[PDB]
Amino acid sequence: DDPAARFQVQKHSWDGLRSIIHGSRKYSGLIVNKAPHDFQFVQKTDESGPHSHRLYYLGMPYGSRENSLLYSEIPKKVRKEALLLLSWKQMLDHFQATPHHGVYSREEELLRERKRLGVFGITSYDFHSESGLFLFQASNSLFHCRDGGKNGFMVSPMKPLEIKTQCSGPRMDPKICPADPAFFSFINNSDLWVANIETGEERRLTFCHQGLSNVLDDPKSAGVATFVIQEEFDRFTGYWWCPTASWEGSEGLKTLRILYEEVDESEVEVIHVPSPALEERKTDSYRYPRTGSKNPKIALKLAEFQTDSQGKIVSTQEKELVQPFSSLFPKVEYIARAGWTRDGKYAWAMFLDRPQQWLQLVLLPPALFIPSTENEEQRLASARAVPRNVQPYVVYEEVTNVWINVHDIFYPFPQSEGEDELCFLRANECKTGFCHLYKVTAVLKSQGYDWSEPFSPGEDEFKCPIKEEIALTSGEWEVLARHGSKIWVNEETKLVYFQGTKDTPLEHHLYVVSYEAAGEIVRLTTPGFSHSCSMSQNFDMFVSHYSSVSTPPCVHVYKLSGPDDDPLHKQPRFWASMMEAASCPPDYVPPEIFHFHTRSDVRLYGMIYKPHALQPGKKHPTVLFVYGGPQVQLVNNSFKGIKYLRLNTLASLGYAVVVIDGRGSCQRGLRFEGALKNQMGQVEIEDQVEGLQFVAEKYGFIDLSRVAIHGWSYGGFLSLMGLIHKPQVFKVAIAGAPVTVWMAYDTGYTERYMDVPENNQHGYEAGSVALHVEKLPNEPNRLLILHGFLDENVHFFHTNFLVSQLIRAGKPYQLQIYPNERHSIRCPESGEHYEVTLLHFLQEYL
Amino acid sequence: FWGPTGPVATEVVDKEKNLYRVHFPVAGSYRWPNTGLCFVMREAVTVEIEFCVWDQFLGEINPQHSWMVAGPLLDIKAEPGAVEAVHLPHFVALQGGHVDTSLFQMAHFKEEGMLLEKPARVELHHIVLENPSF
Amino acid sequence: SPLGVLLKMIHNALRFIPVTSVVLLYHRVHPEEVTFHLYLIPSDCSIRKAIDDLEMKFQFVRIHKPPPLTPLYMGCRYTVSGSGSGMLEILPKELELCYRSPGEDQLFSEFYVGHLGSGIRLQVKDKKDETLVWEALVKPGDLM
Amino acid sequence: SPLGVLLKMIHNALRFIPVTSVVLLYHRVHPEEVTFHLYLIPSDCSIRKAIDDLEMKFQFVRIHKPPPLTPLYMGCRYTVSGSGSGMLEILPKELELCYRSPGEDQLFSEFYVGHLGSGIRLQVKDKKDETLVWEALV
């Protein structure tokens, strides 16, 4: 209204904008830290030495670039009121954990894209307690070392021993056999192998990958987590060692089972996406299941083998279920998770159906798996041989009207007390609406099965009835399950430690409760922060990597201490600190958290970055940054500097930056998340708009006439929905990587927050933004589409089809391609271009 | 130097290690300008001192730029219980402003790790510590 | 679509990048001519003593080596200019700071000038923005 | 243990606290050209003696100019200038006062003079607000 009261952003040159991004970069390098993670406590068991434990973890010292296995020494006694900052001692002697300039295999770079591992080095390692074995993958070759088992500990770093192989190709996903630490296993060429460290002997176990031709002609993999499982159900391994050693007893031999998922991806649609080597101009085929198309044909299988005291894999044996998996378990589309009970009695698996409103946990006893041979008389022979009593037990069956979120919390107790009737813990969001722990006791009542003849299962066929389902937590908050959180169950003191949002939805706190009675929920963390924690296996001391919206992340080591007769009220006392809180840059202003109520009177939270050098009276251009989609919470009391520095850069140029989590964003329960069910894309923008009008009323520096909506994945999809359905409020829309047609996106995501296109035709037509292109603005320079060309998650087709329909409707745009970047702009030069393009676009056209 | 007893140079065993030993024959000491610092002990004593290096103690700590080196990183080899004050060379800012005197964090190393003691008092160009000086 | 935050920008620039200039400036007075080796290797501390021992038993000298103030971002090549390049011989110009293990001889820039005289200028800068990363002139005073 | 000084600072925002210690120029007596090095060090004689040991290995000798009398802020950019700025070839246009050990070589400005003679004027100036803090005739 008043051009003397509308703040004008200073028009910088392009080189000026680069100078700003580099000044962010210099400070930015110090701000980013790649905090220590994957903690592993080991006791010292000396009672006369100085150190009580040794904590092993991944980290980059900063002396070097790549993160490596390290350790700290946790003492028996701290000097009180004088904080111990741990030394970061190196296990390995400064070798390259990754090859030169970050070259990987194509499957390794894909796995780092699914896990979103931006950091280089030893990204994941595996550990075996008693042997003290550290098996990891460095520079596309397995390595190992040992530290304090039957051997002793160290103070100097050693050489990491390389594992010699005759196999040609990368050896992915290594795991130590817990039953026998001399044995390990890995995936090679999408087939399961097994080896032995000291003798070097390797041995293939599966034969599903012929290696003959392209992946369009060689479709069976084994022990490999497929695309939709990797990228929507957060499962990356597809094989699970049996943790105990059984003895079939020929004369002295020892069996070692592995449960694995065989996958026959022949009948699933293949799409070609450009390879990283642009000069070659070739693509890679990808078995990408489009929405509505048929998922891979999955199955569980036991690859067993038998060994001797000399340490040689003497026998081997593939086993498969007595009936085919699809027929023995109808309505089972995806194996969400799997593993074993710790005694070894049963192999468990979480199944999940195609509507994703029907999840059920099942126990599969190893005798249910007969050997596998093409001879149908041997097959009938062992179908006769399997006992009548043994049975898969569908132990738990979650059914819902919204969708099942995969909760990987499942702690089966030992059941040797009362020798039947498995008792386990299980997170259940569908029951009350919020993810809460339960102790559930089911009854394994086998009725007796003739496995030779083929039967058709009924609707509640193997479903065991529940003895009891005591509720350990309740409230308007949830127990954190997904995204690699976990519980820790001390069975000696009979306590279950979980993480949750009980104090407030914006913070993750470590809580403990007893699983005998839901007496009280004891918080073990300071309020006003959000915590990512990790316990000792002895349950005496933990790490917490925590932060707040103002303070950077610190990593403090706490020690549970108190009278042992009352373990539930053990006081966590700060013992020592690992990585203390970094320096916020002087130009960095921590942002302000707010909340508000909608017209439906639901509470939404939001952030705001205020314009630096704010002048009262002046109205400012506002960038509504947005994601707004499920399984992601933008707004929480946590450090927004290491991942959202760009929002601060905008603020430092004078843009108000608003961030709102409307309905759909997680950690606020299923009924909250479920407001987007079959209308995803439609309700979020009303929540974002209402958030603008509230912030406009509350703070007086929000100019409604100049609003930009910027998003990247689902956020870019929403930014385009914003510009379509709310054109008068949103001036411009920087839509990065947008999902423009839902019918093209993959099954796991879309089939869950909407459903199959035959079911929701109105929801797909109203949600696919590329089919609504006529309502985009006729004015130019109001829409900037950003897209990484080699994308495998939100394929380039989406931007391409949007640009196609813009062409057909005669509407302007702008477009920026990142030819070498998959889904996140990975390379810093390309990211710097992205940021200077964003600043320029806002500078000129907002 | 040697405070009350006149000119007695501190014994150096080798230049390349920068080790400085003395035997005090006197009660009480005076500030050494060559070290720029002072420790006081009230009886005859052996002490060894190192000026080693801060880099191989602080680049091993991650938020090292949430600190700055403001001193020499003394190493001391004396018998326990008898040193009664050590004065570390503080670098001054209190002549200006915007520095707290309470949140100061003295760096007491062990093979365990960095310890951050609370110092008893800060001078213009030194700090005084208590009797357990390790 | 699990929110690539996409902040990225992980240069992870090392404080070794000042002492990568110290590896820089190797010259050899074997003949009437004088020539130089240039190295810029971060991501290992042992490369200092490794290339030091390697190039003094390969009969080269260490010079002053002024350090860059900015710990330089990794992933970008740095060009070489000056009064030296364009008059007297420099075989490669640009340096990519890439890692190799300390037991290997690295990429180096070789710089022949013949007689020395009053000195000649070498400069290391970035091609990304053309800002000064490094700048010095050689000595006739740090020789045998 | 080893014992270290307080160096706590803060994490929330900048301070750039001042330092007390000295700024030192070292000399050469080389016959062809005489090269001075102007250092920016924040510490005292033991760190200076470590630098002395290095410089002794590479044939430097030094006269002791008087110290700065205004306190000078740590890590700040300080442009160095002088009478020989421009008319003689010298000084990279920038300098930080950040501490590093003598094992990792210090920041310095080159100065070819030819004859050492007596000595000529030097300048140091803060890039933030252009204040002279020190000069010495040598």
Curated annotation (Swiss-Prot), chain A:
Role description: Dipeptidyl peptidase that cleaves off N-terminal dipeptides from proteins having a Pro or Ala residue at position 2. Acts as a key inhibitor of caspase-1-dependent monocyte and macrophage pyroptosis in resting cells by preventing activation of NLRP1 and CARD8. Sequesters the cleaved C-terminal part of NLRP1 and CARD8, which respectively constitute the active part of the NLRP1 and CARD8 inflammasomes, in a ternary complex, thereby preventing their oligomerization and activation.
Molecular function, one GO term: aminopeptidase activity
Source organism (scientific name): Homo sapiens
PANTHER family, per the entry: DIPEPTIDYL PEPTIDASE 9, PROTEASE FAMILY S9B,C DIPEPTIDYL-PEPTIDASE IV-RELATED
GO biological process: negative regulation of programmed cell death; proteolysis; pyroptotic inflammatory response
Keywords, comma-separated and alphabetical: Acetylation, Aminopeptidase, Cytoplasm, Disease variant, Hydrolase, Nucleus, Protease, Serine protease
Stated regulation of activity: Inhibited by the serine proteinase inhibitor 4-(2-aminoethyl)benzenesulphonyl fluoride (AEBSF), and by di-isopropylfluorophosphate. Inhibited by Val-boroPro (Talabostat, PT-100), a non-selective inhibitor, which triggers pyroptosis in monocytes and macrophages. Val-boroPro inhibits activity by binding to the active site, mimicking a substrate-bound state, thereby displacing the C-terminal fragment of NLRP1, leading to activation of the NLRP1 inflammasome.
Active-site residues from the entry: 713, 791, 823
Tissue specificity of this protein: Ubiquitously expressed, with highest levels in liver, heart and muscle, and lowest levels in brain.
Domain of life: Eukaryota
Gene this protein is translated from: DPP9
UniProt disease annotation: Hatipoglu immunodeficiency syndrome: An autosomal recessive immunologic disorder manifesting in infancy or early childhood, and characterized by failure to thrive, short stature, skin pigmentation abnormalities, pancytopenia, and susceptibility to recurrent infections.
Name of the protein in its database record: Dipeptidyl peptidase 9
From Swiss-Prot, chain B:
Extra information: In macrophages and dendritic cells, NLRP1 inflammasome activation of CASP1 and IL1B maturation can be dampened by direct contact with activated effector and memory T-cells. This effect may be mediated by hexameric TNF ligands, such as CD40LG.
Impact after mutating residue 134 to A: Complete loss of autocatalytic processing and of IL1B release
Record note on domains: The CARD domain, rather than the pyrin domain, is involved in the interaction with PYCARD, CASP1 and CASP5.
Full-sequence range covered: 1079 to 1212 of 1473
Mod. after translation: Phosphorylated by MAP3K20 isoform ZAKalpha, MAPK11 and MAPK14 in response to UV-B irradiation and ribosome collisions, promoting activation of the NLRP1 inflammasome and pyroptosis. This cleavage triggers N-glycine-mediated proteasomal degradation of the autoinhibitory NLRP1 N-terminal fragment via the cullin:ZER1/ZYG11B complex which liberates the activating C-terminal fragment and activates NLRP1 inflammasome.
Family the entry assigns: Belongs to the NLRP family.
Implicated disorder: Vitiligo-associated multiple autoimmune disease 1: A disorder characterized by the association of vitiligo with several autoimmune and autoinflammatory diseases including autoimmune thyroid disease, rheumatoid arthritis and systemic lupus erythematosus.
Disulphide bridges: none
Region annotated ZU5, chain positions: 1-134
Taxonomic placement: Eukaryota, Metazoa, Chordata, Craniata, Vertebrata
Protein role: Acts as the sensor component of the NLRP1 inflammasome, which mediates inflammasome activation in response to various pathogen-associated signals, leading to subsequent pyroptosis. Inflammasomes are supramolecular complexes that assemble in the cytosol in response to pathogens and other damage-associated signals and play critical roles in innate immunity and inflammation.
Protein name: NACHT, LRR and PYD domains-containing protein 1
Origin species: Homo sapiens (Human)
Location relative to the cell: Cytoplasm, Cytosol; Cytoplasm; Nucleus
UniProtKB/Swiss-Prot annotation, chain C:
Result, substituting residue 66 to E: Impaired ability to form the NLRP1 inflammasome
Effect of residue 108 to A: Slightly reduced formation of an inflammasome filament together with PYCARD/ASC
Superkingdom assignment: Eukaryota
Signal sequence region: none
Effect listed in the UniProt record for changing residue 65 to E: Abolished ability to form the NLRP1 inflammasome
Documented effect of changing residue 28 to D: Slightly reduced formation of an inflammasome filament together with PYCARD/ASC
Annotated region described as UPA, given as residue ranges: 1-144
Domain notes: The C-terminal part of NLRP1 oligomerizes to form the core of the NLRP1 inflammasome filament: in the filament, the CARD domains form a central helical filaments that are promoted by oligomerized, but flexibly linked, UPA regions surrounding the filaments. The UPA region reduces the threshold needed for filament formation and signaling. Must recruit the adapter PYCARD/ASC to facilitate CASP1 interaction and polymerization.
Name of the protein: NACHT, LRR and PYD domains-containing protein 1, C-terminus
